[PDB]
Enzyme design. Structure first.
Site, PDB file in Angstrom:
ATOM      1  N   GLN A 162      -6.560   4.427   0.363  1.00 57.63           N
ATOM      2  CA  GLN A 162      -5.767   2.952   0.289  1.00 57.63           C
ATOM      3  C   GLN A 162      -5.855   2.560  -1.137  1.00 57.63           C
ATOM      4  OE1 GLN A 162      -7.056  -0.916   1.611  1.00 57.63           O
ATOM      5  NE2 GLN A 162      -4.984  -0.613   0.549  1.00 57.63           N
ATOM      6  N   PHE A 163      -4.888   1.751  -1.354  1.00 55.11           N
ATOM      7  CA  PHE A 163      -4.751   1.065  -2.523  1.00 55.11           C
ATOM      8  C   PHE A 163      -5.866  -0.052  -3.102  1.00 55.11           C
ATOM      9  CE2 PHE A 163      -3.151  -2.654  -5.484  1.00 55.11           C
ATOM     10  CZ  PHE A 163      -3.030  -1.893  -6.414  1.00 55.11           C
ATOM     11  N   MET A 187       0.055  -6.335  -3.599  1.00 54.13           N
ATOM     12  CA  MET A 187      -0.328  -5.109  -2.817  1.00 54.13           C
ATOM     13  C   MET A 187       0.627  -4.034  -2.674  1.00 54.13           C
ATOM     14  SD  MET A 187      -3.556  -5.708  -2.807  1.00 54.13           S
ATOM     15  CE  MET A 187      -4.396  -4.619  -1.515  1.00 54.13           C
ATOM     16  N   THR A 233       0.851  -1.175  -0.231  1.00 58.20           N
ATOM     17  CA  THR A 233      -0.103  -0.035   0.011  1.00 58.20           C
ATOM     18  C   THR A 233       0.971   1.180  -0.075  1.00 58.20           C
ATOM     19  OG1 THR A 233      -1.856  -1.330   1.173  1.00 58.20           O
ATOM     20  CG2 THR A 233      -1.821   1.256   1.033  1.00 58.20           C
ATOM     21  N   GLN A 234       0.647   2.125  -1.108  1.00 60.94           N
ATOM     22  CA  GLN A 234       1.582   3.300  -1.268  1.00 60.94           C
ATOM     23  C   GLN A 234       0.604   4.625  -1.257  1.00 60.94           C
ATOM     24  OE1 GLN A 234       4.474   3.550  -4.147  1.00 60.94           O
ATOM     25  NE2 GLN A 234       5.310   1.391  -3.881  1.00 60.94           N
TER      26      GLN A 234
END
Ligand SMILES: [Mg+2]
Ligand SMILES: [Mg+2]
Ligand SMILES: [Mg+2]
Lengths: 233, 204, 214, 235, 195, 240, 244, 231, 222
Positions: I1-2, A107, A1-2
């Site tokens: 959030q991704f 992810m 997650t970035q």
């Protein structure tokens, strides 16, 4: 997650009769701050491919390193590295697309939208897109970010389908790209006036143009605009 | 869902003249429901006494653990463990579980067999040692026990007087706590004799 | 998800009856779904909850049952087969599997046997089981009309009529009815029955469903 | 001493060659393939009369369409059979079909050379793998501990193998019936066996497309033995 | 909800466990036996999260049976209860804990005494004259506190147990479909078929 | 980890480590298994060079694997404990996964498989043990008697013996045991088992152990006096 | 590679013997004799120290007799260092059992587990076995007083009276001669010392060359006491039996 | 003698005997021939049988649509190495959308075989391989030896009596190299080449095995009645 | 959030005939309200007379197809160039999908071809691997628009024989390849009118014993 920090905006491109054109501005934004102005977001691979990258700049620099290392590795134990067994745009694209999909599946994505433009060994034009999700598609015109919303409509007026590609010259195609970059400078708040442009032709090869500026702009009519409705002065 | 106040209970320890005392209530509950009135919270390994409040499964587990460790200590050292040493063992063992701790408030009490000096100590759930001359408190009525002990306590009490002071501190603290009570036990510890007395208290 | 599945023990073995409808929200994805899984010629399983979870693991179960009889030279018990499946899903507990099935079989040492197996680890032996969004409707018809000394003909109708009851009332149940009869010598398929045609037929012949104009 | 995966000067693996000597000490097993089916037969060879011969399991089912006979250190075959059964069932799970006999044999032979310094030594057992599939029909394979497998029309393995193989050379033809093949296995087994052949010290089996793999009863084999003796005396 | 009760009398331990198994708005079964025999003179009843209950009970059963075979000897109820407590004490700090509460009724043959142990899912063990899990004790403990005498017979214990079930059937919101009652004494374990 | 291939083939096609494990079995005290019409009896020798023994606590030669199956052995005593433990665990594991106790054949197949695994695993030697496994399958009244050996081969026997001087007692059983008519009763089966051990043992005092297994988990070990009665009876009939 | 230097510690001889186990037993046969005698009301453990020097500190020494828990003790014969490794493992195992079941470990269970560890070193791992033989003396409520022995093979057996180490052949004959079942502890003490006195390789048996221990129920009412004898207590018991 | 116990040991003259013994296994193997022109590449293999009742051991293995090999020696080792080639060819296609070069295929096999000759415990591969293929630089023929040495050739042969076919191809070099756009004639030359390695036996219908790859020809194997044309 | 998933729109359609089968799909690729491509094929020839489409999230769809094509390739290597039957392919694809049960391929998969009796076969999968053989199946954005129309025109649902008092159903029968393509073209032109994610182009893959043929038709580009 970035979360992306230093970012690059639109990359636009199109096919013409003998090759492809790709362009992108030279800006590295830090949110609303237009922090870095000498950023090259078009990266040539060999003399037949140009990778245009938008999104996170730190991840872009990582991809630069991968592509540079890819050229090195291809030359190992390869006498035909500058001939039959040289890197093709299709090889370079599939590699990146593999990496992008692998990273999204862990992810931990590379926060980028990439367009690979080039000419194959048989003269065929190559133009394909890939992004942080590993999503891929091809089209006579391709654009990222705002370019998708504003540039594609202008470029599709020139090349609306496959049959329009042989009818489109490099002069006409370059004119449309340069016009599109002006429109993005008018309407994209994270764009710059300075940009780079690259042409990959099957005859004249790779032409890389740096330090271009948006010009022939229309601003004069602004003087006649007063207030927001009723104001006369 | 607060582990240290599900089962309830209290422990208090005090020093006197050439003696120590440690006392505990006998309640074990499941929140509002009283389950057992025979749940003793004080254990001893040789002449060293250990009281433990908090989550009852951890109380039971830690007793079994320190019995394990003090038995092996004795076999190798060929002597019984002293209170000062045991205190450090308790601290080490608790801090070993720093990021997944036993939800307990232990209390050590005893007399050093060599020097004859009375010793008490308290700990938090991750093993911080709280050494004290006067008294140590632990449990769901610790606030109440602090108030009783701080007013009732005086130095150098004789065993028979110390018994009354610690018993009254515990009883009146327990009656102002819903989760404590249902019986009580007091250990009076002298150099070479230990008396254990069950107190009569209200059963509500 | 949307379904009505039942299975009951009786004098002549086991009846298994299911509906055929699959829904993604209000959208009816399919009317031709198979909610009876043919684990092997002697064992049946019902589909309720996750379609994939039931298909995948009850097919996997058949593979384990085949390996058992190859090594032991004997038919696997329904108890042992149900246990292999329940122990398997119990390993996955918390991960998100969705399963509510009846493992049905008829052996010598056991007789006709049904085990309700479920994704949270439950494993229950019983005489009658109903699972799905329409289980309550089917239970009512089953409980009031069920007897141990039912004939094979009457038992098949009861299972068919019970699914019809649910298909009618439960929005997420319907399409068609699939019947099965499980005997000691193996299961026997008793056809696919469209609920549309079956309803009108039962209405006329039985006198039920007076609330419905036809 | 010396390494387990060592080559001899002649270019062979010592341990593989030594395992072949162990297989020669093993009891005889014969397989014959026909267009009507494949027949498998073995010598049980009980070490003592008190041993219950029916517990001697030297013919084994892998799947409904594949059977197996063994010779040599028969204890080593258990893990090979377990693998074969798992491979057969696993393929059915993945592909909703029967697995090819050749593909099954290949899977078993992949274990063979997975030894060294993996298991500590090669297998000391040879296998005759018989079966049927839609593509190549009735098949017989000889799986060795070298990792090599040959398809055979007929094949004998064990102590009386070289004598039995020479007999199979003359007797086998492409138009053999199933009944003729059954008698031929019994005939050749009786010739190479030490003790006198009967239903208790020898076992028959077959695999057909219709009925699948079947081990024959002692009652059924006894009749085929009696039928065999009468036909030899008839000329 | 799942009701499990336990009463230790003079010469035996009595366990009573509800028969209902409910899932959603449907009673799937009304004859469920919520207990496992750990050894000839030790019985464990259980209640809690679906699946975990039976999986845990059978795992314990297997371990105790293994011990019996290995030593050719029956473990004391105290020893079994300590083993069970430790397993639950391990479980509570695991990735996914067993959410199971148990009662262990046993007859110690060496002491010639009945013993009842109450252990919750946290690993909280107590020896009691009478015990319960869940909401069951909220109704019954007032009756047991009153009528329970330590010198009662098995028949007196069953009558006291009937009094508890009647109170539960009157005041508890759900239908738990009655109870299966089992007795543990010097002669082993047996079930009361008519209750 | 220690990887050495200890069990390997020799030029003549033999695995010496497996064959030397059999020599350890040949050194071990004699064990005999005889199955009758409705029972199986396991007889075992105990060498009499050991006096001042405590027979209460000394490990018994016959071991219960489950309530319905027993295992005796000949060879290295320490090795046998490992096979017995594994067998006992598998017996409970089978009950747990299949709802049914192990068959005698299954339990034998497992133990034999463990023995085989140690003949082609790196860093281990074979078990210097042969076992006699006997009992009755669940809900079955047909007696079962199996034998295993270090190589891993196993088989069923009407009657069998293993250990030192086993070839002598096997010779005895081969002529005395009738397949058509096995020992009809418990007494007949025990007597034949004791008789067979008396060919080898020495004295019939505290040297012979007898264990009788019957259907439905009915296993019992005979005491000294009970066994001595068989010894006294056989010797009187012998003098003829 | 390293194959060249491997002794192969876990293999069979052609005769079916474990080389290293046999050679470990040969080592143990040169170790100081240790005797265990079980009586009806207790157990005696007696052991001879290996050729003592006059400047050896005797009172604060432990070579032969070790405590495993309050109810179980062992007499050692062989490499002391090897024994201590096993002893600490046995002490831990006893505590694990107590922690798990809240009951003191039965003697046999402790003996079996320790013997199983020895067995492992003979079958796998490629390591040398423990050159140690134990005599286990202990009590539990199931079998009462118990004597066991284990050796490097990992095989253990129960005994009424037993010797390990040097001169066991001669020692076992003497024990077999004078031992009887209705024997008391005080009588067993005398037998143990008399046996060592005759089998010893020394000129005369003295207090400084011995280790002694008893396990009686001599404590107050239904409880077991372990007595590891002091030097002066051994001196007294040696005079009392008329050896010195 | 004293230096052939394992692959990790050098002899006093600098030889690796275990590698040489592995090389010996190839000489015992049945003959196989490889040759190429500018447009096509051909493999010809003499298959071997156990006896008349047995089948003939398959010598040729396909690795990709444009690449494959023939084997001589230990067949299981060929299966391992061919499987590795299949994966590497496949990795190149999935990741780079690129057909693996025949030269890289050789380099990968060399490096895989090498690791087995420098480490304790393992053993050298006991098989020789003839890899053919058609890639972006035309037709190719490689010879693999389990020492690690890979060599690109116009033609070659390995196995028993391979010297006869190798001599023939050395004479015929100028002729068969120019057989462009003619598959059948290139095969004929290969069949005539392998015939120089025959003794007592001749090429029959279930004995001969041929494979070909080229410009507009995927790697395909011919067995049975399909090779009757060339006898 | 991704968010690792996306929606590339599109709709697909598989119909099975007597001796043939079709698998159609629009060529439009989208994200939100933007068009990415007017011609991006998502129906593929996978070999062995099997055609396949995995509609929804294109990245997962391309990965799945790519893995199945690879599965077909290795099936040939490991099983002597045996032809992968449509039913065997279906079971294999279940295992591919279920292998990611806890991080699914966000696609609706459909394959088409001929069964082992030479008859037309269509199989449809949910994202986690449940599959079923069907005569008719629409997938994707406009599946809800197309499917009830097929029920009416292919399977003749709700159509009764004229004059029979709604007692005699209209008889089921196999359609010709020409009649099926008519229904496909009318299905997609109708869906193009009413669904914004559907349009640009229509590519149909027809499967017969002779092989795999393609047909392309333009759709409205608005
Ligand atoms: Mg209170
Ligand atoms: Mg209150
Ligand atoms: Mg539009």
């Amino acid at each position: 997650t970035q979360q992306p920090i230093v970012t690059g905006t639109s990359v636009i491109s199109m096919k013409y009769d003998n090759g492809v054109i790709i362009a992108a501005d030279n800006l590295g934004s830090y949110g609303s701050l237009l922090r870095f102005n000498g950023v090259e977001r078009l990266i040539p691979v060999g003399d037949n491919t140009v990778v245009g990258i938008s999104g996170d700049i730190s991840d872009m620099q990582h991809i630069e390193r991968l592509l540079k290392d890819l050229v090195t590795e291809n030359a190992y134990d390869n006498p035909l590295a500058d001939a039959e067994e040289a890197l093709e745009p299709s090889y370079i694209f599939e590699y990146l697309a593999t990496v992008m999909y692998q990273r999204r599946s862990k992810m931990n994505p590379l926060w980028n939208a990439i367009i690979v433009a080039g000419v194959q060994s048989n003269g065929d034009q190559f133009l394909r897109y890939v992004n942080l999700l590993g999503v891929t598609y091809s089209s006579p015109t391709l654009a990222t970010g705002f370019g998708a919303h504003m540039a594609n409509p202008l470029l599709r007026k020139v090349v609306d389908r496959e049959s329009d590609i042989p009818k489109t010259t490099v002069q006409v195609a370059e004119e449309a790209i340069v016009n599109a970059m002006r429109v993005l400078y008018y309407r994209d708040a994270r764009s710059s006036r300075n940009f780079s442009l690259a042409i990959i032709d099957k005859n004249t090869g790779l032409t890389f143009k740096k330090n271009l500026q948006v010009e022939n702009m229309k601003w004069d009519f602004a003087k006649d605009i007063k207030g927001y409705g009723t104001q006369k002065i | 869902s607060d582990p240290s106040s599900i089962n309830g209970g209290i422990v208090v320890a005090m020093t006197g003249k050439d003696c120590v005392a440690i006392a505990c209530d006998l309640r074990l509950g499941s929140q509002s429901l009283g389950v057992s009135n025979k749940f003793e919270k004080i254990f001893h390994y040789g002449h060293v006494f250990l009281g433990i409040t908090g989550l009852a499964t951890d109380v039971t587990t830690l007793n079994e653990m320190f019995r394990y460790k003090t038995n092996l200590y004795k076999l190798k050292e060929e002597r019984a463990i002293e209170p000062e040493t045991f205190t450090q063992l308790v601290s080490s063992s608790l801090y070993e579980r720093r990021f997944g701790p036993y939800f307990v408030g232990p209390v050590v009490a005893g007399i050093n067999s060599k020097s004859g000096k009375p010793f008490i100590a308290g700990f938090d759930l991750i093993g911080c040692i709280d050494e004290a001359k006067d008294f140590i408190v632990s449990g769901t009525a610790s606030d109440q026990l602090f108030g009783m002990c701080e007013s009732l306590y005086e130095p150098n009490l004789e065993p028979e007087d110390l018994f009354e002071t610690i018993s009254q501190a515990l009883l009146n603290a327990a009656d102002r706590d819903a989760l404590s009570g249902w019986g009580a036990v007091v250990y009076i510890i002298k150099k070479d004799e230990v008396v254990k007395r069950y107190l009569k208290m209200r059963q509500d | 998800a949307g379904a009505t599945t039942l299975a009951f023990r009786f004098q002549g073995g086991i009846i298994v009856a299911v509906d055929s409808r699959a829904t993604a929200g209000n959208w009816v994805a399919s009317q031709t779904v198979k909610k009876v899984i043919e684990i092997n010629p002697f064992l049946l399983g019902t589909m309720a909850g996750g379609a994939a979870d039931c298909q995948f693991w009850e097919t996997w179960l058949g593979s384990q049952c085949r390996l058992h009889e190859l090594r032991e030279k004997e038919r696997i018990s329904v108890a042992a087969a149900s246990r292999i499946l329940s122990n398997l899903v119990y390993q996955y507990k918390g991960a998100g599997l969705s399963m509510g099935t009846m493992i049905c079989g008829y052996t010598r040492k056991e007789g006709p046997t049904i085990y309700y197996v479920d994704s949270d680890g439950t494993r229950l032996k019983g005489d009658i089981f109903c699972v799905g969004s329409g289980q309550t409707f089917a239970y009512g018809v089953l409980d009031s009309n069920y007897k141990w000394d039912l004939s094979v003909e009457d038992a098949l109708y009861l299972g068919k009529r019970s699914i019809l009851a649910a298909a009618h009332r439960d929005a997420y149940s319907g399409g068609s009815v699939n019947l099965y009869h499980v005997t000691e010598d193996g299961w026997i398929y008793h056809g696919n029955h469209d609920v549309g045609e079956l309803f009108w037929k039962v209405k006329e012949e039985e006198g039920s469903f007076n609330n419905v104009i036809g | 001493d010396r390494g387990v995966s060592t080559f001899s000067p002649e270019g062979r693996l010592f341990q593989v060659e030594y395992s072949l000597e162990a297989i020669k000490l093993g009891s005889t097993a014969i397989g014959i393939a026909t267009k009507e089916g494949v027949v498998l037969g073995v010598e049980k060879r009980a070490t003592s009369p008190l041993l219950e011969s029916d517990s001697i399991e030297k013919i084994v089912e892998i799947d409904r369409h594949i059977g197996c006979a063994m010779s040599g250190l028969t204890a080593d075959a258990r893990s090979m059979i377990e693998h074969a059964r798992t491979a057969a069932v696993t393929h059915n799970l993945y592909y909703d079909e029967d697995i090819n006999v050749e593909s099954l044999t290949q899977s078993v032979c992949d274990l063979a050379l997975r030894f060294g310094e993996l298991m500590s030594r090669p297998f000391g057992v040879a296998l005759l793998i018989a079966g049927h599939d839609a593509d190549d029909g009735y098949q017989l394979f000889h799986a060795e501990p070298s990792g090599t497998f040959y398809r055979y029309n007929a094949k004998a393995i064990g102590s009386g193998s070289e004598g039995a193989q020479a007999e199979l050379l003359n007797e086998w033809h492409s138009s053999l019936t199933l009944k003729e093949a059954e008698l031929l296995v019994l005939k050749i087994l009786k010739q190479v066996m030490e003790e006198k052949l009967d239903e208790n010290n020898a076992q028959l089996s077959c695999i057909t497309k219709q009925d699948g793999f079947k081990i024959y009863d002692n009652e059924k084999t006894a009749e085929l033995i009696k039928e065999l003796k009468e036909k030899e005396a008839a000329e | 909800m799942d009701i499990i009760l336990g009463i230790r009398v003079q010469d035996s331990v009595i366990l009573a466990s509800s028969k209902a198994v409910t899932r959603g708005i449907s009673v799937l079964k009304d004859s469920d036996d919520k207990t496992r025999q750990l050894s000839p003179h030790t019985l464990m009843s259980f209640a809690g999260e679906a699946g975990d209950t039976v999986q845990f009970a059978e795992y314990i059963q297997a371990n105790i049976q293994l011990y019996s075979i290995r030593e050719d000897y029956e473990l004391s109820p105290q020893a079994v209860s300590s083993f069970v407590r430790q397993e639950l004490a391990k479980s509570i700090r695991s990735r996914r804990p067993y959410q199971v509460n148990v009662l262990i009724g046993g007859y110690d043959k060496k002491k010639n005494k009945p013993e009842l142990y109450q252990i919750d899912y946290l690993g909280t063990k107590v020896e009691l004259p009478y015990g319960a899990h869940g909401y069951s004790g909220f109704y019954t403990f007032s009756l047991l506190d009153h009528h329970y005498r330590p010198d009662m017979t098995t028949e007196e214990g069953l009558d006291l147990l009937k009094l508890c079930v009647q109170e539960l059937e009157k005041r508890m919101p759900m239908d738990f479909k009655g109870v299966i009652v089992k007795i543990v004494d010097k002669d082993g374990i047996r079930q009361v078929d008519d209750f | 980890g220690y990887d050495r291939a200890l069990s390997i083939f020799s030029p003549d096609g033999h695995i010496f480590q497996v064959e030397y494990a059999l020599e350890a079995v040949k050194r071990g005290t004699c064990a005999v298994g005889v199955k009758g019409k409705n029972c199986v009896v396991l007889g075992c020798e105990r060498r009499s060079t050991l006096k001042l023994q405590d027979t209460r606590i000394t490990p018994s030669k016959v071991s219960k694997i489950d309530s319905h199956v027993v295992l005796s052995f000949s060879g290295l005593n320490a090795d046998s404990r490992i096979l017995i433990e594994k067998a006992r665990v598998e017996a409970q594991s089978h009950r747990l996964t299949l709802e049914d106790p192990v068959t005698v054949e299954y339990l034998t197949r497992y133990v034999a498989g463990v023995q085989q695994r140690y003949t082609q695993s790196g860093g281990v030697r074979p078990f210097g043990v042969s076992t006699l496994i006997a009992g009755f399958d669940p809900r079955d009244d047909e007696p079962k008697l199996y034998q295993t050996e270090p190589s891993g081969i196993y088989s069923s026997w009407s009657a069998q013996t293993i250990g030192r001087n086993s070839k002598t007692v096997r010779e005895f059983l081969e002529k005395n045991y009738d397949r058509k008519e096995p020992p009809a009763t418990v007494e007949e089966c025990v007597k034949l088992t004791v008789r067979s051990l008396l060919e080898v043992v020495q004295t019939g005092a505290k040297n012979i152990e007898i264990t009788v297994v019957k259907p439905d988990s009915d296993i019992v070990a005979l005491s000294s006096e009970e066994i001595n009665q068989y010894v006294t009876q056989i010797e009187q009939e012998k003098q003829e | 590679g390293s194959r060249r230097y491997d002794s192969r510690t876990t293999i069979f001889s052609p005769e079916g013997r474990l080389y290293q186990v046999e050679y470990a037993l040969e080592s143990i046969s040169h170790a100081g004799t240790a005797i265990g005698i079980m009586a009806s009301d207790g157990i005696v453990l007696a052991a001879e120290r290996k050729v003592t020097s006059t400047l050896l500190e005797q009172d604060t020494s432990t070579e032969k007799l070790y405590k495993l828990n309050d109810k179980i003790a062992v007499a050692v014969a062989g490499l002391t260092a090897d024994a201590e490794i096993l002893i600490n493992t046995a002490r831990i195992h006893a505590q694990n059992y107590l922690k798990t079941y809240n009951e003191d470990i039965p003697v046999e269970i402790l003996v079996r587990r320790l013997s199983d560890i020895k067995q492992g070193y003979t079958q796998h791992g490629g390591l040398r076995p423990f050159g140690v033989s134990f005599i286990y003396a202990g009590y539990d409520d199931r079998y009462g007083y118990q004597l066991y022995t284990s050796n490097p093979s990992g095989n253990y057996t129960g005994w009424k009276a037993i010797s390990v180490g040097a001169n066991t052949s001669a020692a076992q004959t003497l024990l077999q001669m004078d031992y009887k079942d209705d024997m008391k502890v005080d009588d067993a003490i005398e037998l143990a010392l008399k046996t060592l006195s005759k089998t010893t390789d020394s000129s005369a048996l003295t207090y400084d060359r011995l280790e002694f221990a008893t396990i009686r129920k001599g404590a107050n009412d239904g409880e077991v006491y372990q007595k590891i004898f002091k030097p002066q207590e051994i001196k007294d018991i040696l005079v009392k039996t008329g050896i010195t | 003698n004293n230096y052939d116990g394992d692959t990790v040991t050098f002899s006093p003259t600098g030889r690796l005997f275990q590698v040489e013994y592995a090389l010996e296994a190839i000489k015992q193997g049945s003959v196989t021939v490889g040759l190429r022109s500018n447009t096509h590449a051909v493999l010809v293999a003499l298959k071997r049988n156990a006896d008349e009742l047995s089948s003939y051991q398959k010598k040729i293995i396909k690795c990709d649509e444009h690449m494959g090999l023939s084997l001589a020696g230990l067949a299981p080792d060929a299966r391992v190495l061919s499987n590795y080639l299949r994966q590497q060819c496949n990795y190149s296609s999935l990741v780079f959308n690129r057909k693996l070069a025949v030269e890289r295929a050789g380099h990968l096999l060399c490096d895989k075989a090498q690791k087995n000759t420098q480490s304790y415990g393992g053993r050298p591969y006991g098989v020789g391989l003839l890899i053919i293929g058609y890639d972006k630089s035309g037709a190719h023929l490689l010879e693999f030896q389990p020492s690690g040495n890979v060599t690109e050739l116009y033609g070659t042969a390995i196995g028993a009596r391979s010297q006869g076919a190798k001599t023939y191809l050395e004479r015929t070099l100028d002729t068969f190299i120019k057989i462009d756009g003619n598959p059948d004639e290139l095969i004929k030359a290969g069949v005539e080449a392998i015939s120089q390695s025959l003794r007592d036996e001749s090429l029959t219908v279930d004995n001969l095995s041929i494979a070909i790859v080229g410009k507009d020809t995927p790697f395909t194997i011919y067995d049975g009645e399909a090779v009757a044309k060339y006898i | 959030q991704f968010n690792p998933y996306g929606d590339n729109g599109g709709t697909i359609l598989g119909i099975a005939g007597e001796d043939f089968a079709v698998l159609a799909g629009d060529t439009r690729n989208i994200t939100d309200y933007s068009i990415n491509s007017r011609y991006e094929p998502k129906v593929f020839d996978c070999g062995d007379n099997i055609v396949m489409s995995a509609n929804g999230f294109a990245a997962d769809g391309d990965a799945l197809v790519k893995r199945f094509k690879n599965s077909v390739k290795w099936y040939h290597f490991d099983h002597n160039d045996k032809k992968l039957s449509i039913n065997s392919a279906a079971r294999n694809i279940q295992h591919l999908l279920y292998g990611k049960r806890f991080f699914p391929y966000y696609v609706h998969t459909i394959i088409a071809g001929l069964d082992e009796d030479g008859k037309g076969a269509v199989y449809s999968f949910d994202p986690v691997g449940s599959y079923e053989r069907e005569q008719c199946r629409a997938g994707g954005a406009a599946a809800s628009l197309i499917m009830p129309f097929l029920d009416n025109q292919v399977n003749f649902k709700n159509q009764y024989e004229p004059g029979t008092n709604g007692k005699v159903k209209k008889p089921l029968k196999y359609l010709s390849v020409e009649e099926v393509i008519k229904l496909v073209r009318d299905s997609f032109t109708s869906a193009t009118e009413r669904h914004i994610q559907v349009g640009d182009g229509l590519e149909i893959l027809i499967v017969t014993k002779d092989g795999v043929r393609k047909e392309f038709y333009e759709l409205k580009r608005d």
